[PDB]
Amino acid sequence: TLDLVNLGVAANFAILSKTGITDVYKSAITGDVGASPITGAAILLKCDEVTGTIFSVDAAGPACKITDASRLTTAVGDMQIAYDNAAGRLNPDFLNLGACTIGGKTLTPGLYKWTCTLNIPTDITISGSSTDVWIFQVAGNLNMSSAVRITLAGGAQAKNIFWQTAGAVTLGSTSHFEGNILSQTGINMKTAASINGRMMAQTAVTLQMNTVTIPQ
Structure with a gap:
């Protein structure tokens, strides 16, 4: 079996970014959100959009924000360790599955590698x-x-799925995603797309009327 990716303190966040969180009102986020080292002014969420705590490095951000630089520093550091751990796994089970388009597949457990942009144009099962x-x-x-x-089939849980991306993620409008996203750049969701997972971006997270839930 494949070892879990350890998210350390970043496990406590539904959304964690380095350059902020943009939003087309109204989104429904369940779990904590944060951004560091950027000012909390870069978190464009309202308090009624988050069931959880909104963390800021400073005095700026949504009215309900909690200022906690040291926890956000640990979280983002733990996110970079997780990203490097996931990207560093060797001996993949698959390379370039579906020639980078995987619509209609059922994906069984293991380590998958793509040296390309991955596209998911139709429904998949994990x-x-x-x-x-x-x-x-x-x-x-x-x-x-x-x-x-x-x-998800067979008992597969969102908390045991990790997507490591060197480039940006784009989840189309009304799409439903499962698993943790460790992105080296952005995670960009569209109108009423949902995710059961975490959005861990080393640039920004961008939302448009999304439902985001931390895996249970």
Whole structure:
């Protein structure tokens, strides 16, 4: 079996970025959100959009913000360790599956690697036990089309799925995603897309009327 990616303090966040969080009102986020080292003014969420705590490095940001530089410093550092751990896994089970377009696949547990932009234009299933692990290594961008749903089968849990992307993620409008996203750049969601997972971006997270839930 594949070892879990350890997220350390970043596990406590539904959204964690380095250059902020933009939003087209209204989104529904369940879990804590933060950004560091950017000012909390870069978190464009309202208090009614977050069930959890909004963390700021400073006195700026949404009215309900909690200022805690040292926790955000640890979280972002733990996110970079996680990113490097996920990107550093060797001996993949698959390389360039579906020639970088994986619509209609059922993905069984293991380490997958793509030396390309990964596209998900139609529904996929992730199928495995409640203890199985998936690590998806994407050297490029990751695109999922409007209305595409990731279905979990067999007991597979969102908390045991990790998507490591060297490029930006784009989740199309009304798409449903499952798993943790460790992005070296942005995570960009569209109109009423949902995610059961964490959005961990070393640039920005951008939302448009999204539902975001930390995995349970």
